[PDB]
Amino acid sequence: TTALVCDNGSGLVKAGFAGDDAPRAVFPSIVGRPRHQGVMVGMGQKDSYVGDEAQSKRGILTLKYPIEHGIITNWDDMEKIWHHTFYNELRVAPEEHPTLLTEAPLNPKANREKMTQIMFETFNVPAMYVAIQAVLSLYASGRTTGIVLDSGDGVTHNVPIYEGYALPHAIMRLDLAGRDLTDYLMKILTERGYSFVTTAEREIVRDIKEKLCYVALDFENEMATAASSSSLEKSYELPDGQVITIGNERFRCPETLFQPSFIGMESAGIHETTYNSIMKCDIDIRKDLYANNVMSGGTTMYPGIADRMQKEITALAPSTMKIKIIAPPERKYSVWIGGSILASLSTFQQMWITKQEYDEAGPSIVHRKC
Amino acid sequence: NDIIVLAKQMCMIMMEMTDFTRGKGPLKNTSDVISAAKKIAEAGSRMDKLGRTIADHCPDSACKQDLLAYLQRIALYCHQLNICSKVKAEVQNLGGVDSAMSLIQAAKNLMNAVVQTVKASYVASTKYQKSQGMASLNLPAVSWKMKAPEKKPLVK
Amino acid sequence: NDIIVLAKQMCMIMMEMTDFTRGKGPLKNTSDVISAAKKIAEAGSRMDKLGRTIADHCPDSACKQDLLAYLQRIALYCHQLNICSKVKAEVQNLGGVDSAMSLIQAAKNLMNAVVQTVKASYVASTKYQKSQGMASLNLPAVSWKMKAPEKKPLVK
């Protein structure tokens, strides 16, 4: 009788029960398969590991992400991820709880349709729903007006909402997020002689990026400071005890969000994308969109990203405007918190896609109910 | 009038929230704001039943449509405040005026929806007084403390 | 639940083994550790039949694959402990915390495999309860003492 809320990100699964204030399962959205020779009898029967199971044993596994850029690419590994989520992590029976799922905007329709079908036919959920992650972030922030900049492992998206009305023509999606920054950091770590190639070493580099990287308020003076001194250099100890030092890779990696040309993309930075999304909205709502810049997702968790974000948008916007960037401390789970707010809402209970409706109208019911 | 006194005591709470926003009021920091959000949401749910009853005693194609619209807004806002206050409580317990801003914005939204619901309820009760059911509510356009609207300035 | 009580009493044994590792527990030296290894291996074989039955009452392309994986791990760990305990009994009889380390490591491995087998068995029984055969086992997801998972910390 209590709904489930599974936030399937590209990087992490955030799962829990509607009504709660925090997910109960947060594990990597990876499936690992052994890549070496099993030489002991019975030690190689398990052919696949999911979640923290795979990060624990990643030294003998090949780690694969079922989701790239917010689109599910492996539907047998994602199916394993969902089975893990329901049975090993949450330990529920899916056919008694309605499940709320999340999806990025401007995403293929087959993604949503196959999620609907997998739920209703492999997990027999009584009902389900697919919600847009930026609307859920705005739910969690306690607002009904504001432009949400949500950055995850796979996608960065801007959804402007005013008085509960979205402006879908001003939604901007950008396939540049945490995994692209991890790849860029692996690339520019080679300048110091550090070679991380394996998927496990990619997880190591993701850890380095989360612990050491930050966003420079002014990039050029930070490059000058790093060149002049060694005050910005920090060390990091690898899983086998080697120590690496990185000086300007710390703020060069997150700068790819504001200069996507670092990784060869032609698009505009997240500040320019946010401004361009605000200026596709009606002139009468732009003032309230400027003052409510909700940032959610884990790629917005760099130290200094809100200050740089506000500085850049202030440069772009008129000088009489009211630029505020809203970055809650818990914004790494804003999508899940908003999903649990919505799934527990009393007025939402007629908005589930029941299995009767699915049986009438096939998986295509999800484009018209959601 | 139950509706008026409930909305107006919630207005007292929402005043104390703005006074914390100005930095000088009866609330010291975020914890008092979380508690105030919880009680304003509870009083909003009470307001929700009051609106439900006034709507249920009203004809279909009447002012009940606007009233139900505002009641659904009230439901969304009260629920958001309770989860957001619980989230802020957990965040404080683990680790913030910026944090208080989300709760205060939700409270402003709720109070605006409650004012809209109050006037909608008054119109519904006055317009359909001696329709049956409304008499049992006993809301005779006088229990509502409606001032006369003040005149416009002829020259601006 | 037979599975839960068997695994948890083995956990009591494995706690006593770690307590000897810390140097302060109910075991004086290697001989007590050898005896404890023998009984934990015996209880592991009992656990092995319990897993065998739960697997045999399960559909093929189901959670029985993981369960059989963990059961094969259990069988190797129990076998290693029984031969290794016999080896070190002979070594002591002929001639050692360092010696205790191999048995304690095998016991840690066995206990980890048993925890994995416990959760796999629970998933297999819950997921396929009113499939025939599982009802005869009478393991209705309540005999399993599964706590609700605790919430994550929002801020770290």
Ligand SMILES: Nc1ncnc2c1ncn2[C@@H]1O[C@H](COP(=O)(O)OP(=O)(O)O)[C@@H](O)[C@H]1O
């Ligand atoms: N403290 C941090 N600093 C910078 N990046 C982070 C931090 N924590 C997580 N990330 C990045 O955020 C991504 C996960 O964020 P999340 O919002 O969970 O993504 P998704 O919605 O795709 O699951 C990961 O790629 C990780 O690299």
Ligand SMILES: [Mg+2]
């Ligand atoms: Mg996300």
